[PDB]
mmCIF file of all heavy atoms in Angstrom:
data_model
loop_
_atom_site.group_PDB
_atom_site.id
_atom_site.type_symbol
_atom_site.label_atom_id
_atom_site.label_comp_id
_atom_site.label_asym_id
_atom_site.label_seq_id
_atom_site.Cartn_x
_atom_site.Cartn_y
_atom_site.Cartn_z
ATOM 1 N N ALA A 37 171.104 59.690 -64.635
ATOM 2 C CA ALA A 37 170.852 58.280 -64.549
ATOM 3 C C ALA A 37 170.728 57.914 -63.126
ATOM 4 O O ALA A 37 169.914 57.097 -62.760
ATOM 5 C CB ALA A 37 171.961 57.520 -65.169
ATOM 6 N N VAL A 38 171.591 58.512 -62.305
ATOM 7 C CA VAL A 38 171.471 58.271 -60.891
ATOM 8 C C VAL A 38 170.150 58.847 -60.380
ATOM 9 O O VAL A 38 169.355 58.123 -59.743
ATOM 10 C CB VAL A 38 172.643 58.859 -60.137
ATOM 11 C CG1 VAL A 38 172.310 58.957 -58.692
ATOM 12 C CG2 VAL A 38 173.872 57.997 -60.366
ATOM 13 N N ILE A 39 169.909 60.128 -60.640
ATOM 14 C CA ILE A 39 168.698 60.781 -60.179
ATOM 15 C C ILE A 39 167.481 59.972 -60.460
ATOM 16 O O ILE A 39 166.630 59.872 -59.625
ATOM 17 C CB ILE A 39 168.491 62.147 -60.794
ATOM 18 C CG1 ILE A 39 169.389 63.173 -60.129
ATOM 19 C CG2 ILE A 39 167.070 62.596 -60.597
ATOM 20 C CD1 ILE A 39 169.425 64.466 -60.862
ATOM 21 N N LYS A 40 167.344 59.375 -61.641
ATOM 22 C CA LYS A 40 166.106 58.644 -61.845
ATOM 23 C C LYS A 40 166.110 57.365 -61.027
ATOM 24 O O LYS A 40 165.090 57.016 -60.404
ATOM 25 C CB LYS A 40 165.764 58.370 -63.304
ATOM 26 C CG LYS A 40 164.453 57.595 -63.435
ATOM 27 C CD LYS A 40 163.888 57.685 -64.854
ATOM 28 C CE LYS A 40 163.038 58.966 -65.041
ATOM 29 N NZ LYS A 40 163.738 60.167 -64.412
ATOM 30 N N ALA A 41 167.247 56.661 -61.003
ATOM 31 C CA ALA A 41 167.364 55.493 -60.138
ATOM 32 C C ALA A 41 166.857 55.852 -58.736
ATOM 33 O O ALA A 41 165.996 55.171 -58.183
ATOM 34 C CB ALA A 41 168.755 55.048 -60.082
ATOM 35 N N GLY A 42 167.366 56.922 -58.182
ATOM 36 C CA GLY A 42 166.806 57.493 -56.982
ATOM 37 C C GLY A 42 165.275 57.693 -57.018
ATOM 38 O O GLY A 42 164.585 57.269 -56.106
ATOM 39 N N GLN A 43 164.766 58.315 -58.049
ATOM 40 C CA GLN A 43 163.346 58.542 -58.032
ATOM 41 C C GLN A 43 162.574 57.250 -58.173
ATOM 42 O O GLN A 43 161.499 57.116 -57.664
ATOM 43 C CB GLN A 43 162.866 59.601 -59.000
ATOM 44 C CG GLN A 43 163.761 59.915 -60.162
ATOM 45 C CD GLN A 43 163.375 61.247 -60.781
ATOM 46 O OE1 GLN A 43 163.933 61.713 -61.795
ATOM 47 N NE2 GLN A 43 162.381 61.892 -60.133
ATOM 48 N N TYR A 44 163.139 56.289 -58.862
ATOM 49 C CA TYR A 44 162.405 55.079 -59.039
ATOM 50 C C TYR A 44 162.328 54.350 -57.685
ATOM 51 O O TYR A 44 161.226 53.911 -57.269
ATOM 52 C CB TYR A 44 163.076 54.197 -60.103
ATOM 53 C CG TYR A 44 162.644 54.457 -61.556
ATOM 54 C CD1 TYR A 44 163.595 54.559 -62.560
ATOM 55 C CD2 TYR A 44 161.315 54.573 -61.935
ATOM 56 C CE1 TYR A 44 163.279 54.752 -63.839
ATOM 57 C CE2 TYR A 44 160.969 54.749 -63.240
ATOM 58 C CZ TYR A 44 161.949 54.875 -64.201
ATOM 59 O OH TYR A 44 161.642 55.057 -65.542
ATOM 60 N N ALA A 45 163.419 54.292 -56.964
ATOM 61 C CA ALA A 45 163.424 53.569 -55.706
ATOM 62 C C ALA A 45 162.584 54.249 -54.597
ATOM 63 O O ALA A 45 162.250 53.615 -53.601
ATOM 64 C CB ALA A 45 164.837 53.370 -55.250
ATOM 65 N N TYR A 46 162.283 55.504 -54.751
ATOM 66 C CA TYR A 46 161.438 56.181 -53.778
ATOM 67 C C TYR A 46 160.007 55.818 -54.132
ATOM 68 O O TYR A 46 159.151 55.581 -53.253
ATOM 69 C CB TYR A 46 161.564 57.681 -53.825
ATOM 70 C CG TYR A 46 160.610 58.388 -52.946
ATOM 71 C CD1 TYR A 46 160.996 58.858 -51.714
ATOM 72 C CD2 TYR A 46 159.285 58.598 -53.324
ATOM 73 C CE1 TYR A 46 160.135 59.510 -50.887
ATOM 74 C CE2 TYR A 46 158.391 59.246 -52.514
ATOM 75 C CZ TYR A 46 158.830 59.720 -51.280
ATOM 76 O OH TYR A 46 157.968 60.363 -50.419
ATOM 77 N N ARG A 47 159.739 55.747 -55.397
ATOM 78 C CA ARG A 47 158.457 55.271 -55.793
ATOM 79 C C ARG A 47 158.348 53.829 -55.356
ATOM 80 O O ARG A 47 157.374 53.424 -54.689
ATOM 81 C CB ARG A 47 158.353 55.357 -57.267
ATOM 82 C CG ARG A 47 157.079 54.908 -57.788
ATOM 83 C CD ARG A 47 157.211 54.821 -59.289
ATOM 84 N NE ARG A 47 157.895 53.600 -59.723
ATOM 85 C CZ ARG A 47 158.121 53.303 -60.996
ATOM 86 N NH1 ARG A 47 157.744 54.153 -61.940
ATOM 87 N NH2 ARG A 47 158.710 52.168 -61.308
ATOM 88 N N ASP A 48 159.341 53.016 -55.700
ATOM 89 C CA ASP A 48 159.121 51.608 -55.580
ATOM 90 C C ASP A 48 159.157 51.105 -54.124
ATOM 91 O O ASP A 48 158.658 50.024 -53.851
ATOM 92 C CB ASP A 48 160.083 50.810 -56.484
ATOM 93 C CG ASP A 48 159.688 50.930 -57.927
ATOM 94 O OD1 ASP A 48 158.473 51.191 -58.189
ATOM 95 O OD2 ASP A 48 160.547 50.810 -58.827
ATOM 96 N N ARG A 49 159.674 51.907 -53.207
ATOM 97 C CA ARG A 49 159.555 51.527 -51.822
ATOM 98 C C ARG A 49 158.112 51.390 -51.425
ATOM 99 O O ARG A 49 157.696 50.427 -50.853
ATOM 100 C CB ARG A 49 160.268 52.505 -50.901
ATOM 101 C CG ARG A 49 161.537 51.988 -50.322
ATOM 102 C CD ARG A 49 162.004 52.850 -49.157
ATOM 103 N NE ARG A 49 162.441 54.184 -49.554
ATOM 104 C CZ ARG A 49 163.410 54.391 -50.432
ATOM 105 N NH1 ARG A 49 164.003 53.367 -51.022
ATOM 106 N NH2 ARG A 49 163.798 55.649 -50.716
ATOM 107 N N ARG A 50 157.333 52.417 -51.811
ATOM 108 C CA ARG A 50 155.889 52.410 -51.694
ATOM 109 C C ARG A 50 155.250 51.284 -52.444
ATOM 110 O O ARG A 50 154.312 50.653 -51.970
ATOM 111 C CB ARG A 50 155.354 53.727 -52.252
ATOM 112 C CG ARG A 50 154.979 54.763 -51.239
ATOM 113 C CD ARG A 50 155.706 56.037 -51.476
ATOM 114 N NE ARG A 50 157.042 55.930 -50.919
ATOM 115 C CZ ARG A 50 157.635 56.907 -50.227
ATOM 116 N NH1 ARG A 50 156.974 58.027 -50.041
ATOM 117 N NH2 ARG A 50 158.841 56.724 -49.752
ATOM 118 N N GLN A 51 155.736 51.051 -53.657
ATOM 119 C CA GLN A 51 155.145 50.043 -54.497
ATOM 120 C C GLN A 51 155.322 48.651 -53.866
ATOM 121 O O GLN A 51 154.350 47.876 -53.770
ATOM 122 C CB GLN A 51 155.830 50.047 -55.880
ATOM 123 C CG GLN A 51 155.249 51.088 -56.860
ATOM 124 C CD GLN A 51 155.353 50.664 -58.337
ATOM 125 O OE1 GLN A 51 155.358 51.501 -59.227
ATOM 126 N NE2 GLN A 51 155.442 49.364 -58.570
ATOM 127 N N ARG A 52 156.513 48.373 -53.406
ATOM 128 C CA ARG A 52 156.830 47.043 -52.922
ATOM 129 C C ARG A 52 155.696 46.543 -52.025
ATOM 130 O O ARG A 52 155.257 45.407 -52.123
ATOM 131 C CB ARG A 52 158.129 47.072 -52.131
ATOM 132 C CG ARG A 52 158.792 45.730 -52.073
ATOM 133 C CD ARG A 52 159.926 45.647 -51.136
ATOM 134 N NE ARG A 52 160.890 46.706 -51.350
ATOM 135 C CZ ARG A 52 161.158 47.609 -50.431
ATOM 136 N NH1 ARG A 52 160.501 47.521 -49.275
ATOM 137 N NH2 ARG A 52 162.060 48.543 -50.611
ATOM 138 N N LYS A 53 155.255 47.413 -51.162
ATOM 139 C CA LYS A 53 154.273 47.060 -50.163
ATOM 140 C C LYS A 53 152.960 46.661 -50.786
ATOM 141 O O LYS A 53 152.244 45.790 -50.314
ATOM 142 C CB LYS A 53 154.124 48.193 -49.168
ATOM 143 C CG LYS A 53 155.451 48.579 -48.601
ATOM 144 C CD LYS A 53 155.430 49.887 -47.885
ATOM 145 C CE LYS A 53 156.704 50.082 -47.107
ATOM 146 N NZ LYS A 53 157.804 50.660 -47.920
ATOM 147 N N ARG A 54 152.675 47.280 -51.916
ATOM 148 C CA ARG A 54 151.483 46.858 -52.644
ATOM 149 C C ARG A 54 151.772 45.500 -53.259
ATOM 150 O O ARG A 54 150.966 44.552 -53.164
ATOM 151 C CB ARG A 54 151.127 47.871 -53.783
ATOM 152 C CG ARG A 54 151.425 49.307 -53.403
ATOM 153 C CD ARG A 54 150.890 50.225 -54.475
ATOM 154 N NE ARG A 54 151.229 51.633 -54.198
ATOM 155 C CZ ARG A 54 151.205 52.613 -55.107
ATOM 156 N NH1 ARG A 54 150.836 52.328 -56.367
ATOM 157 N NH2 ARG A 54 151.517 53.855 -54.771
ATOM 158 N N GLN A 55 152.936 45.356 -53.862
ATOM 159 C CA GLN A 55 153.158 44.159 -54.666
ATOM 160 C C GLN A 55 152.992 42.931 -53.812
ATOM 161 O O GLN A 55 152.262 42.038 -54.192
ATOM 162 C CB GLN A 55 154.540 44.201 -55.318
ATOM 163 C CG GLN A 55 154.623 45.196 -56.456
ATOM 164 C CD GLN A 55 155.769 44.870 -57.358
ATOM 165 O OE1 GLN A 55 156.726 44.227 -56.954
ATOM 166 N NE2 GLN A 55 155.660 45.302 -58.623
ATOM 167 N N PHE A 56 153.605 42.924 -52.657
ATOM 168 C CA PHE A 56 153.574 41.703 -51.838
ATOM 169 C C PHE A 56 152.165 41.411 -51.402
ATOM 170 O O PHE A 56 151.717 40.294 -51.602
ATOM 171 C CB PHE A 56 154.539 41.779 -50.668
ATOM 172 C CG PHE A 56 155.946 41.557 -51.094
ATOM 173 C CD1 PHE A 56 156.870 42.563 -51.009
ATOM 174 C CD2 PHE A 56 156.333 40.346 -51.612
ATOM 175 C CE1 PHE A 56 158.142 42.355 -51.431
ATOM 176 C CE2 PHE A 56 157.628 40.137 -52.019
ATOM 177 C CZ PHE A 56 158.534 41.130 -51.923
ATOM 178 N N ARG A 57 151.469 42.382 -50.813
ATOM 179 C CA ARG A 57 150.105 42.096 -50.410
ATOM 180 C C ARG A 57 149.350 41.425 -51.545
ATOM 181 O O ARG A 57 148.678 40.399 -51.328
ATOM 182 C CB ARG A 57 149.361 43.333 -49.938
ATOM 183 C CG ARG A 57 147.873 43.024 -49.689
ATOM 184 C CD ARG A 57 147.118 44.264 -49.266
ATOM 185 N NE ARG A 57 146.745 44.199 -47.855
ATOM 186 C CZ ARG A 57 145.520 44.254 -47.384
ATOM 187 N NH1 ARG A 57 144.486 44.441 -48.201
ATOM 188 N NH2 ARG A 57 145.283 44.194 -46.089
ATOM 189 N N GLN A 58 149.473 41.935 -52.751
ATOM 190 C CA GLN A 58 148.758 41.269 -53.842
ATOM 191 C C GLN A 58 149.269 39.884 -54.100
ATOM 192 O O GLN A 58 148.491 38.981 -54.409
ATOM 193 C CB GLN A 58 148.631 42.159 -55.080
ATOM 194 C CG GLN A 58 149.529 41.776 -56.277
ATOM 195 C CD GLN A 58 149.192 42.581 -57.539
ATOM 196 O OE1 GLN A 58 148.163 42.377 -58.172
ATOM 197 N NE2 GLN A 58 150.084 43.520 -57.881
ATOM 198 N N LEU A 59 150.587 39.652 -53.920
ATOM 199 C CA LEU A 59 151.148 38.254 -53.991
ATOM 200 C C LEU A 59 150.498 37.361 -52.967
ATOM 201 O O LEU A 59 150.101 36.225 -53.260
ATOM 202 C CB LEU A 59 152.631 38.259 -53.688
ATOM 203 C CG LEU A 59 153.398 37.261 -54.536
ATOM 204 C CD1 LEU A 59 154.426 36.493 -53.759
ATOM 205 C CD2 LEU A 59 152.446 36.323 -55.212
ATOM 206 N N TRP A 60 150.421 37.861 -51.745
ATOM 207 C CA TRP A 60 149.873 37.146 -50.636
ATOM 208 C C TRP A 60 148.437 36.833 -50.930
ATOM 209 O O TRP A 60 147.997 35.688 -50.867
ATOM 210 C CB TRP A 60 150.007 37.971 -49.342
ATOM 211 C CG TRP A 60 151.433 38.256 -48.994
ATOM 212 C CD1 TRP A 60 152.510 37.509 -49.301
ATOM 213 C CD2 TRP A 60 151.900 39.385 -48.263
ATOM 214 N NE1 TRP A 60 153.645 38.086 -48.810
ATOM 215 C CE2 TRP A 60 153.315 39.206 -48.165
ATOM 216 C CE3 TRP A 60 151.307 40.468 -47.661
ATOM 217 C CZ2 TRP A 60 154.095 40.159 -47.492
ATOM 218 C CZ3 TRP A 60 152.091 41.385 -47.002
ATOM 219 C CH2 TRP A 60 153.465 41.239 -46.906
ATOM 220 N N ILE A 61 147.677 37.868 -51.257
ATOM 221 C CA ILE A 61 146.250 37.662 -51.412
ATOM 222 C C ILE A 61 146.054 36.574 -52.466
ATOM 223 O O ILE A 61 145.308 35.614 -52.242
ATOM 224 C CB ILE A 61 145.525 38.962 -51.754
ATOM 225 C CG1 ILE A 61 145.292 39.798 -50.481
ATOM 226 C CG2 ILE A 61 144.203 38.664 -52.402
ATOM 227 C CD1 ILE A 61 145.542 41.291 -50.653
ATOM 228 N N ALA A 62 146.792 36.672 -53.544
ATOM 229 C CA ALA A 62 146.630 35.781 -54.658
ATOM 230 C C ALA A 62 146.761 34.367 -54.121
ATOM 231 O O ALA A 62 145.936 33.484 -54.379
ATOM 232 C CB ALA A 62 147.662 36.032 -55.723
ATOM 233 N N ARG A 63 147.815 34.139 -53.361
ATOM 234 C CA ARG A 63 148.026 32.770 -52.931
ATOM 235 C C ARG A 63 147.097 32.360 -51.782
ATOM 236 O O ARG A 63 146.678 31.213 -51.723
ATOM 237 C CB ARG A 63 149.514 32.472 -52.755
ATOM 238 C CG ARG A 63 150.261 33.355 -51.848
ATOM 239 C CD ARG A 63 150.565 32.557 -50.562
ATOM 240 N NE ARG A 63 150.571 33.365 -49.346
ATOM 241 C CZ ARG A 63 150.904 32.904 -48.135
ATOM 242 N NH1 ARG A 63 151.254 31.629 -47.962
ATOM 243 N NH2 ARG A 63 150.874 33.751 -47.109
ATOM 244 N N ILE A 64 146.683 33.271 -50.917
ATOM 245 C CA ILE A 64 145.634 32.924 -49.968
ATOM 246 C C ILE A 64 144.405 32.356 -50.697
ATOM 247 O O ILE A 64 143.812 31.355 -50.288
ATOM 248 C CB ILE A 64 145.200 34.116 -49.128
ATOM 249 C CG1 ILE A 64 146.252 34.432 -48.089
ATOM 250 C CG2 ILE A 64 143.889 33.819 -48.429
ATOM 251 C CD1 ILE A 64 146.270 35.866 -47.662
ATOM 252 N N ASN A 65 144.069 32.973 -51.814
ATOM 253 C CA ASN A 65 142.909 32.595 -52.585
ATOM 254 C C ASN A 65 143.075 31.203 -53.202
ATOM 255 O O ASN A 65 142.183 30.354 -53.102
ATOM 256 C CB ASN A 65 142.687 33.595 -53.701
ATOM 257 C CG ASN A 65 141.241 33.819 -54.002
ATOM 258 O OD1 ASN A 65 140.782 34.937 -54.124
ATOM 259 N ND2 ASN A 65 140.505 32.736 -54.129
ATOM 260 N N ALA A 66 144.204 30.995 -53.846
ATOM 261 C CA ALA A 66 144.520 29.687 -54.412
ATOM 262 C C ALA A 66 144.178 28.620 -53.420
ATOM 263 O O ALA A 66 143.504 27.646 -53.719
ATOM 264 C CB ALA A 66 145.980 29.597 -54.786
ATOM 265 N N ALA A 67 144.639 28.858 -52.169
ATOM 266 C CA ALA A 67 144.574 27.887 -51.107
ATOM 267 C C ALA A 67 143.157 27.795 -50.566
ATOM 268 O O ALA A 67 142.623 26.708 -50.399
ATOM 269 C CB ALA A 67 145.524 28.257 -50.017
ATOM 270 N N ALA A 68 142.558 28.963 -50.273
ATOM 271 C CA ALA A 68 141.193 28.967 -49.769
ATOM 272 C C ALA A 68 140.305 28.246 -50.728
ATOM 273 O O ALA A 68 139.431 27.459 -50.346
ATOM 274 C CB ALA A 68 140.730 30.411 -49.636
ATOM 275 N N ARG A 69 140.529 28.521 -51.990
ATOM 276 C CA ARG A 69 139.653 28.061 -53.064
ATOM 277 C C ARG A 69 139.852 26.561 -53.176
ATOM 278 O O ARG A 69 138.939 25.802 -53.468
ATOM 279 C CB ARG A 69 139.911 28.932 -54.341
ATOM 280 C CG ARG A 69 139.720 28.341 -55.740
ATOM 281 C CD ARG A 69 138.324 28.539 -56.458
ATOM 282 N NE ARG A 69 137.770 29.898 -56.554
ATOM 283 C CZ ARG A 69 138.259 31.018 -56.034
ATOM 284 N NH1 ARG A 69 139.373 30.991 -55.342
ATOM 285 N NH2 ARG A 69 137.616 32.148 -56.177
ATOM 286 N N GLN A 70 141.037 26.125 -52.846
ATOM 287 C CA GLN A 70 141.342 24.699 -52.877
ATOM 288 C C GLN A 70 140.581 23.959 -51.808
ATOM 289 O O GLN A 70 140.165 22.829 -52.009
ATOM 290 C CB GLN A 70 142.830 24.475 -52.689
ATOM 291 C CG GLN A 70 143.247 23.028 -52.826
ATOM 292 C CD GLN A 70 143.534 22.650 -54.262
ATOM 293 O OE1 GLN A 70 143.735 23.523 -55.122
ATOM 294 N NE2 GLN A 70 143.574 21.353 -54.524
ATOM 295 N N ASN A 71 140.434 24.573 -50.616
ATOM 296 C CA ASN A 71 139.566 24.066 -49.545
ATOM 297 C C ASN A 71 138.092 24.423 -49.696
ATOM 298 O O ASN A 71 137.325 24.366 -48.742
ATOM 299 C CB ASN A 71 140.004 24.580 -48.186
ATOM 300 C CG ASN A 71 141.389 24.140 -47.842
ATOM 301 O OD1 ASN A 71 141.694 22.964 -47.854
ATOM 302 N ND2 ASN A 71 142.224 25.103 -47.524
ATOM 303 N N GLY A 72 137.719 24.831 -50.904
ATOM 304 C CA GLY A 72 136.329 25.091 -51.221
ATOM 305 C C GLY A 72 135.744 26.326 -50.586
ATOM 306 O O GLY A 72 134.618 26.283 -50.143
ATOM 307 N N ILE A 73 136.494 27.418 -50.564
ATOM 308 C CA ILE A 73 135.931 28.703 -50.125
ATOM 309 C C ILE A 73 136.611 29.784 -50.910
ATOM 310 O O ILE A 73 137.783 29.686 -51.240
ATOM 311 C CB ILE A 73 136.155 28.949 -48.609
ATOM 312 C CG1 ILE A 73 135.043 29.821 -48.058
ATOM 313 C CG2 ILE A 73 137.482 29.636 -48.365
ATOM 314 C CD1 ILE A 73 135.418 30.515 -46.804
ATOM 315 N N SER A 74 135.912 30.862 -51.241
ATOM 316 C CA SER A 74 136.510 31.966 -51.918
ATOM 317 C C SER A 74 137.353 32.823 -50.953
ATOM 318 O O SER A 74 137.027 32.897 -49.767
ATOM 319 C CB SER A 74 135.440 32.836 -52.525
ATOM 320 O OG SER A 74 134.988 33.793 -51.573
ATOM 321 N N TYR A 75 138.372 33.512 -51.460
ATOM 322 C CA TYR A 75 139.175 34.360 -50.598
ATOM 323 C C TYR A 75 138.306 35.317 -49.821
ATOM 324 O O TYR A 75 138.453 35.471 -48.606
ATOM 325 C CB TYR A 75 140.154 35.178 -51.401
ATOM 326 C CG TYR A 75 140.774 36.339 -50.653
ATOM 327 C CD1 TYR A 75 142.093 36.302 -50.270
ATOM 328 C CD2 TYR A 75 140.048 37.470 -50.363
ATOM 329 C CE1 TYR A 75 142.653 37.346 -49.616
ATOM 330 C CE2 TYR A 75 140.613 38.515 -49.712
ATOM 331 C CZ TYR A 75 141.923 38.429 -49.331
ATOM 332 O OH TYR A 75 142.465 39.497 -48.672
ATOM 333 N N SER A 76 137.388 35.979 -50.526
ATOM 334 C CA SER A 76 136.484 36.955 -49.934
ATOM 335 C C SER A 76 135.797 36.387 -48.691
ATOM 336 O O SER A 76 135.922 36.957 -47.621
ATOM 337 C CB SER A 76 135.431 37.356 -50.925
ATOM 338 O OG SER A 76 136.039 37.597 -52.181
ATOM 339 N N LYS A 77 135.058 35.302 -48.850
ATOM 340 C CA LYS A 77 134.375 34.745 -47.710
ATOM 341 C C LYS A 77 135.412 34.363 -46.614
ATOM 342 O O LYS A 77 135.226 34.754 -45.464
ATOM 343 C CB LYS A 77 133.502 33.542 -48.097
ATOM 344 C CG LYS A 77 132.270 33.902 -48.869
ATOM 345 C CD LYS A 77 131.445 32.654 -49.164
ATOM 346 C CE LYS A 77 130.660 32.182 -47.902
ATOM 347 N NZ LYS A 77 130.498 30.654 -47.706
ATOM 348 N N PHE A 78 136.457 33.654 -46.998
ATOM 349 C CA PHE A 78 137.495 33.213 -46.053
ATOM 350 C C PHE A 78 137.966 34.380 -45.169
ATOM 351 O O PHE A 78 137.970 34.257 -43.940
ATOM 352 C CB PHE A 78 138.652 32.547 -46.796
ATOM 353 C CG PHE A 78 139.851 32.283 -45.915
ATOM 354 C CD1 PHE A 78 139.719 31.550 -44.739
ATOM 355 C CD2 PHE A 78 141.089 32.782 -46.222
ATOM 356 C CE1 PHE A 78 140.799 31.281 -43.935
ATOM 357 C CE2 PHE A 78 142.187 32.523 -45.420
ATOM 358 C CZ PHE A 78 142.028 31.775 -44.259
#
């Protein structure tokens, strides 16, 4: 049980960094799009 907890957190350290960027991007878009521009163009 410990060992997997270990393996999950080694995976998820890497994951975390993905998760946030996608959080950020999502909300950049909400905002950009609110000012009438797509995230991509912005």
Side-chain angles (χ1 to χ4, degrees):
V38 164
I39 282 169
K40 180 162 275 43
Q43 22 196 183
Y44 273 133
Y46 174 99
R47 180 190 80 179
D48 288 335
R49 253 195 290 304
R50 258 124 279 223
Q51 276 209 204
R52 204 190 307 118
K53 305 167 169 84
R54 326 186 183 162
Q55 286 201 336
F56 284 112
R57 171 182 254 237
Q58 107 173 287
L59 218 222
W60 298 332
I61 279 138
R63 55 108 212 185
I64 285 153
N65 214 134
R69 148 94 52 355
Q70 185 87 17
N71 298 306
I73 209 202
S74 86
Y75 166 108
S76 317
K77 287 182 77 216
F78 171 55

